[PDB]
Design a protein around this ligand. Structure first.
Ligand SMILES: [Mg+2]
Ligand SMILES: [Mg+2]
Lengths: 337, 337
């Protein structure tokens, strides 16, 4: 089979903020794998702060030899080989993984949620983000979207956390999921900041402290009234077991774990250890978002709005209907170029 | 879909003996699930010393309502519903799981090893047992089948252990895997054994001492020269994690874990936790044997010779070739009635 790839920068509709960073674009590489007339689509999204770039991803993909593989169904052997080409480049490896499942699914004539034996009717509601701004700009956007979602996401980990909730909580009573994003470097300042939110309608807390301080995080979890989910603290399958106890659940993202195959294994592992599972995303096109939505029926929370934040999506895949992630019946990852 | 099932006693070629129980037959129920003209085959084998019977199985299967399910692909929902019908009955449950996978594979037009993305060329060599008897006989049968296998299985933990090995070892140099069955009581006594056996060409120890003494086991394993696998120490997915550090790996049997879906999860979990995996079986037809063989490319050791021990197999499935478990390309579980 043949693989091709090219840079495809994502244009964000509005300033996008993460911790102390902001951007209006996101480096991204689009991947394709052709085989006997069939094409599987893959994608790598690279928020600048995560360490990968157009260059690194393009370089990594140049190092992948797929022509040496005659059977696309050997995802175990093929993706194991891909992983071996470098110690990281998880986003770059995800693009190949995603493209391969798309291809395999197409060849099987089935969506991966089906191949995996899940009920698409059990997909969750996805959160949508309420950016940080002035009490006016805030209540405005909250107003504009509260009618389309069942749960909203707020990126706290800031200074006016208690502020945002109030502003937002004034013009809406929708449950809120907060992502400190490692903003609360303290310990007690984070624990109580949670009982508070819990009193103000928040229903889940994600990545409170920085990954480095696992002791603080762990500590804060058994004393937290709301489920804490690991994000920055977990990258791949081998990082899951070590988080039991420290977190209530894990947040899986294809760009971080290297794709669908490892992601699915993480869902199985997390659950086997009694942990909860949520699925997240970076700003991505409908390619990676749909790929991850394929296993969303098996999770508890989903932050799969990535494609809604960009203006140059090149695929029509999963739609948000009645606030829920909605899978179509297209085979593979479920998108149409 | 319509599920039918009827008793099908397995006739063993020779007296089969385990521990203190000898028999020449095996209670077994054959299951079939029909959907739009496609039929999936399932099976439940019940060694009369493992709690289930033709009755327990037949009654459980009668409590199963599948006509309420319009979509065979919903394996998660369906098998979850089947598991909820009772606290045990794993064999009866495994039968429904197996038939459902066969059906789904057939509808997808692919074998499960392929759906799971494995390389069929990586199937393992399977063992065959050299029962206990007199030197002439031991050395006899040992020579009658050593030409067709690459590894032989021997149930130790008895009084005639040290000499049983030397007997077989006298007429063959084939590596040996031993199944102690919680035999060795003294923990120091068992550790020395693994040393003597490894000296006599043994490459694997299965369930050395009792399960209620995981402590001694863990002790032995941390310093054992050979990998130790758990069999009696576990039954289902939920029991796997509780063996990490104590055992080198786990042995999976469809009749105990309720089938393929859970088995596949067990393989993922064990590997995720750094443990090894092996797959076994009860005396069964090629239905259950081929079903389990579908994920054998992902295991380290395999004892999949069940069908070879019976004289009334109803299916043609995986074959032993050059000592290797050999998968064919038939969809589903890989069998032909
Ligand atoms: Mg996050
Ligand atoms: Mg055994």
């Amino acid at each position: 089979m043949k693989m091709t790839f090219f840079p495809y920068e994502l244009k964000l509709r509005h300033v996008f903020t993460v911790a102390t960073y902001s951007r209006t674009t996101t480096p991204d590489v689009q991947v394709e794998i052709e085989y006997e007339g069939v094409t599987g689509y893959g994608e790598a999204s690279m928020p600048p702060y995560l360490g990968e770039t157009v260059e690194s991803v393009m370089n990594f993909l140049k190092k992948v030899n797929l022509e040496q593989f005659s059977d696309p169904f050997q995802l175990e052997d093929i993706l194991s080989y891909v992983d071996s080409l470098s110690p990281k480049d998880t986003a770059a490896k995800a693009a190949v993984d995603i493209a391969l499942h798309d291809l395999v699914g197409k060849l099987l004539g089935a969506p991966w949620y089906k191949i995996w034996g899940l009920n698409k009717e059990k997909t969750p509601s996805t959160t949508f983000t309420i950016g940080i701004d002035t009490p006016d700009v805030v209540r405005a956007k909250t107003k504009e979207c509260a009618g389309l979602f069942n749960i909203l996401k707020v990126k706290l980990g800031r200074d006016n956390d208690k502020e945002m909730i109030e502003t937002i909580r004034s013009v809406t009573d929708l449950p809120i999921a907060v992502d400190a994003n490692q903003g609360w470097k303290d310990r007690q300042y984070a624990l109580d900041m949670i009982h508070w939110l819990k009193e103000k309608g928040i229903v889940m807390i994600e990545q409170p402290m920085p990954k480095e301080q696992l002791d603080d995080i762990a500590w804060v979890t058994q004393q937290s009234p709301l489920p804490v989910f690991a994000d920055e603290s977990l990258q791949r399958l081998g990082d899951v077991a070590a988080l039991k106890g420290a977190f209530t659940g894990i947040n899986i993202k294809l760009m971080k774990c290297t794709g669908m195959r490892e992601a699915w294994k993480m869902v199985t592992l997390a659950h086997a250890l009694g942990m909860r599972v949520m699925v997240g995303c970076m700003t991505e096109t409908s390619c990676a978002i749909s790929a991850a939505s394929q296993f969303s029926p098996a999770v508890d929370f989903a932050d799969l709005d990535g494609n809604l934040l960009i203006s140059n999506d090149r695929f029509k895949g999963v739609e948000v209907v009645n606030g829920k992630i909605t899978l179509n019946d297209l085979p593979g990852i479920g998108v149409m170029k």
